[PDB]
Structure 1
Amino acid sequence: MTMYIAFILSTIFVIGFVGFSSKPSPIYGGLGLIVSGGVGCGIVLNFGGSFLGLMVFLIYLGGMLVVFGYTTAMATEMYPEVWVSNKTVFGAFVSGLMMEFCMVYYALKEEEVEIIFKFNGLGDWVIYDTGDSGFFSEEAMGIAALYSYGTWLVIVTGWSLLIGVVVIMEITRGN
């Protein structure tokens, strides 16, 4: 429909995870996460969070995952398994299908799913709050505090990234 669009996207998000959790060929597994990464931003986008969502596209989907499949490109064997290949991969995929079907069926009929966390099965929209945000975006004005309140965060995350640059050379140096 359109009311369940976040639910619809969330459903594609779960099945997208089964795509790469089943551990298919690394390129194909990356693609299964690429769509999973794509829809997940839309879930965030529907809740607001434009900037936080946009990063999932930019620095993760077009970022971390680009060099991810890039490594799989020059590595890996000469015979990449096609999604069907090993019967376990398709067995894992159908296995992921039966988990999301049983809960969703249970979610939309009895609405009293208690698996681990007790969760009531209503539409996505019955959780949004109310109120006007004035002239400032809540997400934009929050992470803009990186340089006004994010004092100890910047000092530590910056320092580790510099150590991140030095650790990667030291491991890749080859002594």
Structure 2
Amino acid sequence: MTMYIAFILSTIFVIGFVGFSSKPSPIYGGLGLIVSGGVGCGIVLNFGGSFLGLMVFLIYLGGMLVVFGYTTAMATEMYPEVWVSNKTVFGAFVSGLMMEFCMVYYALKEEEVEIIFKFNGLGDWVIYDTGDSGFFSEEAMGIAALYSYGTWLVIVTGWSLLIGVVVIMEITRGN
């Protein structure tokens, strides 16, 4: 319920990740990944990251993964390797649905899950901070500083992107 709503979105995020990480068909893996891409935005939205949340929709859901479909349409291994095609992918998918189900139950009971880090299984809502942001959206003012203080990053990010296009055509030119 809405008590632990962000508990939910985080959960489909994990199962969405287990989807493509289980190495299913690249389109199906794309389907599982974009599902995780879709649900992950809600996690950021719940924290007030509307601008950041909307971007991953734009340049990662409607961005990177669209051209991924081209290579899948270009690869086209002679038979679909959808989940029914192989049995290891089922085992990979089935497995990846266990331990995260195990530790949430581990975290829901006593909350003292010590996997690598100590972790609290308390409700997602707690770690939020109380305080008005006035009229300036904190997310917006942070990003807009791109052109105020992020001068140095802008040059390096731009220069690499320019070098990004010079390499891509050069490697793909095939001599």
- Structure 2 length as normaliser, TM-score? 0.98
Distance between the aligned counterparts of 2:59 and 2:165, measured in 1? 17
Q: Deviations along 1:123-173, whole A, 9 cap, x unmatched? A: 000110010000010001101000000011001000000000000001000
1:100 CA displacement: 0.9
Structural mapping, 1:126-145, within 5 Å: 126-145=126-145
Q: Determine the C-alpha separation between the residues in 2 that align with 1:160 and 1:50.
A: 27
State the match for 2:12 in structure 1. Answer: 12
- Tell me how far apart the structure 1 counterparts of residues 46 and 137 of structure 2 sit (CA, whole Å): 14
Q: What are the superposed Cα offsets for residues 68-87 of structure 1, whole Å, 9 maximum, x if unpaired?
A: 11211122312111212211
How far the C-alpha of 1:120 sits from its partner, in A, is: 1.1
User: What does the per-residue CA deviation read over 1:59-113, in whole Å, with 9 as the maximum and x for residues that have no partner?
Assistant: 0000000001121112231211121221100000111011111110001001000
> What SS does structure 2 have at the residue aligned with 1:126?
coil
Gaps of 5+ in 1: none
Count of residues paired in the alignment: 175
In 2, distance between residues paired with 1:39 and 1:70? 23
Tell me, in whole angstroms, the C-alpha distance in 1 between the residues paired with 2:51 and 2:3: 23
Q: Distance in 1 between matches of 2:84 and 2:119?
A: 35
CA distance in 1, matches of 2:75, 2:102: 38
For residue 113 of structure 1, give the secondary structure of its aligned residue in structure 2. Answer: coil
Deviation string for 1:2-22 (max 9, x for gaps)? 121111000000000000000
Structure 2 Cα separation of the partners of residues 151 and 100 of structure 1: 42
Match of residue 120 from structure 1? 120
Structure 1 runs, 4 residues or longer, greater than 3 Å off: none
Distance 1:168 1:99 in 2: 40
In 1, Cα distance between the equivalents of 2:115 and 2:81? 35
- CA-based RMSD: 0.7
Q: TM-score, normalized by length of structure 1?
A: 0.98
Counterpart Cα distance in 2 of 1:83 and 1:113: 32
Task: Give SS of 2:163's match.
Answer: helix
